[PDB]
Amino acid sequence: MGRVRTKTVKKAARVIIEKYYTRLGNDFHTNKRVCEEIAIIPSKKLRNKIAGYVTHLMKRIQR
Amino acid sequence: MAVQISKKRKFVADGIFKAELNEFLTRELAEDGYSGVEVRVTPTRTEIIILATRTQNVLGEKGRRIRELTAVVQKRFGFPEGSVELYAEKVATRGLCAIAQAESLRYKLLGGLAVRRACYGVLRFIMESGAKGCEVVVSGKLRGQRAKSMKFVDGLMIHSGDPVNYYVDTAVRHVLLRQGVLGIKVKIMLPWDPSGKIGPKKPLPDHVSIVEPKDEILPTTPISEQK
């Protein structure tokens, strides 16, 4: 594969999970549409990454 | 489309006219703070909006300069009368007008001055007027006869990717002296991004960022509000 997520993703991912904690599922598609609506995302492809990491954080935080 | 040219050739011919004009004007309006043009053909009229910083020096005595220039263009490209009409326009905020800022540096240099102080004077002005950052280079001779470079830099700058097309403007100017030639280059980075003009798009320089509003509370307890 290759590819480790950049700092722009991991930095903003933390903010977005913190303040809208109770607005996340554990599904990709729901968490995608939420990020588009609660905040500006300057691209679509960038959104699809940041959502997926926000999802991955939300799995562990309930443990 | 007789006697005119086919569609492939139609756009090329427009470009040649756009380009010749843009270098014609620059050799006789540089000191009057030239900054470009913006042509627009409209029904039965050409408008050539001669953008310059200081409209005072552009006008001359009884609109003389605008009259000379219009008579030239009317003959050169062989249009009949009542076609071409020039107009002037003053541009607000000169710290985003790289072309004019470069030509200001030119005359400051040709005024007889050192390079560091001149560059500094241009720098703070374009930064103060509102910019993300800015840069000046002057490469050529001074204090010897080997060439050198002196870079003066402040703020942010980009150099890679497609955002370069939006967020910077760039000018190049040759300036003469009695011994050799000096090359000027000016690069200035535009400040607008989300709010204002609106013009520039959202992607930030080289770390594309998300801006996130805040609110998330509840106060709920059982009640029915009957209306």
Place this chain on the structure above:
RNA sequence: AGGAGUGGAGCCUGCGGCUUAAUUUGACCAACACGGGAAACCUCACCCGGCCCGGACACGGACAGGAUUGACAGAUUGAUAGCUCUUUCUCGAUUCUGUGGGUGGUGGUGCAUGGCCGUUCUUAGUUGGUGGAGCGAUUUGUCUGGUUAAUUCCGAUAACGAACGAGACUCUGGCAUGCUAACUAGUUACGCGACCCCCGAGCGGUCGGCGUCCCCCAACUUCUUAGAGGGACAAGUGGCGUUCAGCCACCCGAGAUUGAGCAAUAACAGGUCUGUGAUGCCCUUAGAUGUCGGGGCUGCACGCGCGCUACACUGACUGGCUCAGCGUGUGCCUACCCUACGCCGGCAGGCGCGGGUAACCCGUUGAACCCCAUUCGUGAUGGGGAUCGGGGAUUGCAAUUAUUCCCCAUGAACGAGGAAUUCCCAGUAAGUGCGGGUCAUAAGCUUGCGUUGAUUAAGUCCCUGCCCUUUGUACACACCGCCCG
């Protein structure tokens, strides 16, 4: 690990050397089919002859029986250049003559320079603020470890918070029977009438099949077109990992990686004064380095580089069958395009008419290898087409040293390549054709495009080279260094 070659042969083309009136000139991984440099004239810088002034402007002089311009004929001359001379009119103050002053130059200097480009360097590198450590040059931040393609992250920590490059971005490719809408795009449906054959059920009728004209105020938008959107996230599952960052396999399905563009700091005495009316200085300037005629840049005892075609039978030859894509085009510069169709000619070609400013016309671009059947027979053979004789066409003002094309004849080396060495991992290598660029005439070149389509790897630091740490140094012009008798 392998594939195909180069180095051998012939030819094309660039470079050196040699010759020569001149064979103009830059360039020696990062020069050498490079200067988009395929030169008939032109180009043109070169060589040999001749002509021209288009020497502004200033000051003084000349001077209206006059400053001054041009020329018939003869001589002279490549020349019908009144160039020069003989001969003698015309023009009318624009000039001419002297001096001052310039002006032009593909003249020189890329080691006087701007601009642009190449390369170091395509790898992951780079810096300041405040604070800390040192008398200081400096250092820490910019890291023991894990991880990544990555100064990519996790984590640790006298540093903390940032910036540039990286990714992000843009363009391009692979996925939509969803959306938007189509006589310059199609399809379907009949209506068909017409042609056609029984071609199929049947009989030949009728029904159906095959395409074209006919088609519509028909129906539709799967196919073609181009816009907005959607889709892909390590998301899901199982392993593995500090259980972090991630990694491997698998499900789903189109696998997160289809290919480019853009690209940092610092540097080079790298290339370009022959792109520049960008430019310094120097040089030359009327017996001109600025124009015409004609010649050369192609001259050959050698040497070297990029390529092209071959050495056959997995072939050649002669008939027959059958499939594309990127483009381009007169109306532009001072003058020119792409071509259907009809006729004439073996061929090259000529001739008569017509369309196209272009999803409309050329062109449903009916291309090649491929495919099928004849002939040749392991033979320097019909493989190979070099060299060369004779003849016909086209472009141009002109084709001689043969511009290009065609016809018949002529029929060389070459029998798979020594020492060495290049390039390449999936629609990729290789085979194979087409369009653009240059272009009056002309690609063996270069740049794009389709078609046919493998083998071999899933690694390593052995060689060559590059990045990071530690260490040693008499090195810093940096080992292409320094230094001893």
Place this chain on the structure above:
RNA sequence: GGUCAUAACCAUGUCUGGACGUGGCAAGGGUGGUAA
């Protein structure tokens, strides 16, 4: 508690190369015009 080996040869360099000097902050302006 833990296991792993064999080093041939290899010399020299035509070279007349590097832009660094003093803390300036500092344009400062509006006749036309709908009304007038």
